[PDB]
Amino acid sequence: MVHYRTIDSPIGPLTLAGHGSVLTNLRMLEQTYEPSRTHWTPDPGAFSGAVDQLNAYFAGELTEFDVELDLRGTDFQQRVWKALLTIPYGETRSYGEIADQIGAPGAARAVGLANGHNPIAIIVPCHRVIGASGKLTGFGGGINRKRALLELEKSRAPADLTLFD
């Protein structure tokens, strides 16, 4: 029995969910049909490790996530979601690049589709893929959320100013 906890964030209410200390979900779930959520047990308590990290990512301090993930979906989806994890904070790839990486040259359009079913939204960074055109995808508010996340990372001040002295 999945337990979930919704928290607040600059891109809106982010619902977190899974069994115990492993994540299965992370979306902003408001204003779309999400019947799976009714089958879940609320829990203001769990996932607080990840809630900390989320707060810090938005604060601009965190760059890398340490979190347990159980990613479920088709085999193709997992290879795609696994490759998304290999994208560094504040970088991008093309759907074409991801297809090459997971060994399926030409599946750019298949990677776009897999991307939109990413069950864990910030920690698995689907926002960091963008096509040649440079146009953002995602459904409705999803686009503005993505842009937000992209402007966030791109903006982060260098960590150690002492390298300048």
From Swiss-Prot:
It is found in: Cytoplasm. It comes from Mycobacterium tuberculosis (strain ATCC 25618 / H37Rv). This is Methylated-DNA--protein-cysteine methyltransferase. The keyword DNA repair applies. GO terms for molecular function: methylated-DNA-[protein]-cysteine S-methyltransferase activity. Involved in the cellular defense against the biological effects of O6-methylguanine (O6-MeG) and O4-methylthymine (O4-MeT) in DNA. Repairs the methylated nucleobase in DNA by stoichiometrically transferring the methyl group to a cysteine residue in the enzyme. This is a suicide reaction: the enzyme is irreversibly inactivated. The gene is ogt. This enzyme catalyzes only one turnover and therefore is not strictly catalytic. According to one definition, an enzyme is a biocatalyst that acts repeatedly and over many reaction cycles. Coiled coil: none annotated. The active site is at residue 126.
